[PDB]
Amino acid sequence: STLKHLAIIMDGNGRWAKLKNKARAYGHKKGVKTLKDITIWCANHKLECLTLYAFEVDFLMKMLKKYLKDERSTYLDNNIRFRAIGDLEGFSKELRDTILQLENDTRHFKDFTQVLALNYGSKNELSRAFKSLLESPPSNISLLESLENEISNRLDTRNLPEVDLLLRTGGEMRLSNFLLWQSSYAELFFTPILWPDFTPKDLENIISDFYKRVR
Amino acid sequence: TLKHLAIIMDGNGRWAKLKNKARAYGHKKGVKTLKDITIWCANHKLECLTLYLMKMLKKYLKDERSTYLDNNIRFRAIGDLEGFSKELRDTILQLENDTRHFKDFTQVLALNYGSKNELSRAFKSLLESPLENEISNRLDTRNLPEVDLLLRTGGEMRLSNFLLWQSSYAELFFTPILWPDFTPKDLENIISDFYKRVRKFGE
């Protein structure tokens, strides 16, 4: 209702693997099932938007694409639109290619959207928004003074609602250059629970608290 | 490593209603908290402290001018000053001029301030006269360090459009303590916690 856009910094993966004394890989892979579960739950709960802070480099981008071509099927099956934010220009044509395609393919779903922040940084997003305005100004730029609406509409998140609740798992209490502009009035939630241990139940408890705050 | 502390001072009104006192009373108490915390930060060698109805502002600036001069506290205002009267805008500018020569610690008051508007003005400026660093250097906080610790008193847990860019990697603290009741000792407890967080991430 009042909660339309939930954003999450999924922290605690590698660390969750460490307490089980395991290699970094085990951790993230599990982190990936939570992501799936959490998104499906949000999809089935009338959330309008969920943004997740996704993140030798060529290799990571290999796994990403695999990751996306793999679950491509789960976006269609649960009616979930896909959107990527971040500096995609720094991607291999192949990844940028699969990214753009999953977007095309899912642009049909309008109820729930899952946004993945990839090679994402808020200061960088704002910098690119600025470059966007300098390179292609609004035609009436001359008659303008306040540019907030103009910036809002050039950010990677244009047309998504603002963030209502920004959650960070894993124990740390910092925004980490994530959706700074979009979370200007978001309710902030923090939990020590590591990401791979995070459940829809835990998220249900947090949402319950959210409503309590929202007098 | 704590160089820039920023604080959202909230709870003055709620504090006055609890005490069945007039708002002005909660504001007067709040100004006393602001003064004590500012002096504490200067004595503890922070580089910068940023703090987030005009009646009280002109009075404060007039009455407190002497405390700045008497404690080597440089004063700077951030925010949209055009939205102020000639008189007020001039008094703010004059206090900055009166204290620009103090170079160790700066108290920054965010007046008619919002981050989105600050970024808007910086963007307008760059478009007009042409990246992260360029933007950073056109913000109102241009010659200050990034925020190391952003604290919000009063109980709410939201950034409220305050120093969003500058607090990108700041450690966030929240306390239910209402601003008029907040003391230097409370801040001392928060800062010991800050240093403990810093030890823990590297551990």
Swiss-Prot record, chain A:
Assembly, per entry: Homodimer.
Known cofactor(s): Mg(2+)
Residues the record lists as binding substrate: G12, N13, G14, R15, W16, R24, H28, R168, R174, L175, S176
Protein's job: Catalyzes the condensation of isopentenyl diphosphate (IPP) with allylic pyrophosphates generating different type of terpenoids.
NCBIfam families reported for this sequence: PRK14833.1, uppS
Active site, UniProt feature: D11
InterPro entries: UPP_synth-like (IPR001441), UPP_synth-like_CS (IPR018520), UPP_synth-like_sf (IPR036424)
Bound cofactor: record note: Binds 2 magnesium ions per subunit.
The name this protein goes by in its record: Isoprenyl transferase
Alphabetical UniProt keywords: Magnesium, Metal-binding, Transferase
Annotated GO CC locations: cytosol
GO MF term set: ditrans,polycis-undecaprenyl-diphosphate synthase [(2E,6E)-farnesyl-diphosphate specific] activity; magnesium ion binding
Alphabetized SUPFAM superfamilies for the sequence: Undecaprenyl diphosphate synthase (SSF64005)
UniProt entry tagged with the keyword Metal-binding: yes
Protein source organism: Helicobacter pylori (strain ATCC 700392 / 26695) (Campylobacter pylori)
Binding, Mg(2+): D11, E187
A GO biological process held by the record: polyprenol biosynthetic process
Domain of life: Bacteria
